[model samples]
Target: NASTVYVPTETSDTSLTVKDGFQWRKYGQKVTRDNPSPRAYFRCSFAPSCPVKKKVQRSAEDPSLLVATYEGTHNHLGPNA
Candidate 1:
C-alpha cells in the first residue's frame, strides 16, 4: 500500500530538503515529463534494517503543494508510525 502527504509550499523546501518526523537519507532524484520539478527518493535512516522508501514531489498543477509517496512498511515504530 501507498500513502500521499500534502504540505504547503510556504515551507520553501525541495523534495530532498523536506523533513519528515523520521530521518531519511536521500538516494536519488529525477525530473519527470509530468512535471518540471524533480522528484526525490529516500529511505528511512532511523533503522538500517528498515525497508520503507519514499518519493517526494511538487504537484504538477500547483507548485505550492508538495506530495510525498511512501512505499513498503517501516520496520520499527516512530512518531509517524
Candidate 2:
C-alpha cells in the first residue's frame, strides 16, 4: 500500500485543529463518504509546487478518524522549521 503523508495547516485558532509537525496546503473539498459534511483537501504546499497532495475526510461511520489519501511524492527537505 502507498503511504499517506500528513500536512498540518492550522495557523490560527480558526483553522481546523490538526496534529503537530504536519504541514499542508488547501487544494479542494468533497462531501464526505460517511458523512454529509464536506472535507477539505490539501497538498504539501511547503514545496509550493510539489506534486504531493492528499485528500482528507472523516468517515461518516467514524468521524474520529481522519482519512487522508495521498497523491504523488515530495522532493525537497523541510525548512529549518
Candidate 3:
C-alpha cells in the first residue's frame, strides 16, 4: 500500500516521537545504510486492534527535522475525534 509522509516539528532528542492524536508504542530502531541517523519504528496502540504503524527518523542533513512514514489505517477514532 502507498504510505503517507509527514515532516514533524523538530526536536533535539535523538529518540524520535510523533504526536498526531494517537498513542504509539515504539517497537524497534535501526541505523539505515543510506542515512547516518537512526530510524525508530512504532505501532499505534490506542486501540488493541489498531493496525497503524509508523517509522520516525531525523533528517540526516538537518538534525532538527523529523520524517514520519505511516502505514495502515486506525480502526477507531483519534484523540480529536
Candidate 4:
C-alpha cells in the first residue's frame, strides 16, 4: 500500500467533524484544480506515526463555510483500534 490509502465510501454519506479545541500541526498544504481554496494537511502531535489526519480550508465561493476533512483509520494504535 502507498503512504496514503483511499477507502471506498460514498461522498453523500460522509460527514464533517467540527473543530473542538484540539491543536493540530500542519504538515503540507495543497490546492487542487477542482477547488480554488487550498487544502491544509495536519497530523496528531500525540502520535507521530499515527495515520490520523484532518484537512481544513475555506470554501472558494462561500467564505463563510469551512471545509473540514478527516481520516479516522490508524494502524499504529495497536493490533486493532
Single out the weakest 10-residue window by summed lDDT for candidate 1: 10-19
| Residue lDDT tens for model 4, 1-81 | 223322332334323223434545678888789775566778755456666677766656555566666676554433322
Which scores better on TM-score, 1 or 3? 1
Task: Note each model's CA RMSD in angstroms.
Answer: 2.9, 5.1, 2.6, 8.6
Report the CA-based lDDT of candidate 4 relative to the real structure.
0.55
- Candidate 2 segments exceeding 4 Å error: 1-22, 32-34, 46-48
Instruction: Score residue 48 of candidate 2 by CA lDDT.
Output: 67
Candidate that beats the other on lDDT, 2 or 3, i.e. the better one:
3
What C-alpha lDDT, on a 0 to 100 scale, does residue 3 get in candidate 4?
38
Model 2 clash pairs are: 7-23, 8-22, 8-23, 34-60
Clashing pairs in 4: none
TM-score of each: 0.78, 0.58, 0.74, 0.53
For each candidate, the alpha-carbon lDDT, in order, equals 0.78, 0.58, 0.78, 0.55
lDDT of 3 by residue, 1-81 (tens): 447565655465666776788888888989878887889989887645887889988876666678888888888888655
Cα RMSD for predicted model 2: 5.1
Return the lDDT, model 2, position 5. Answer: 38
lDDT of 1: 0.78
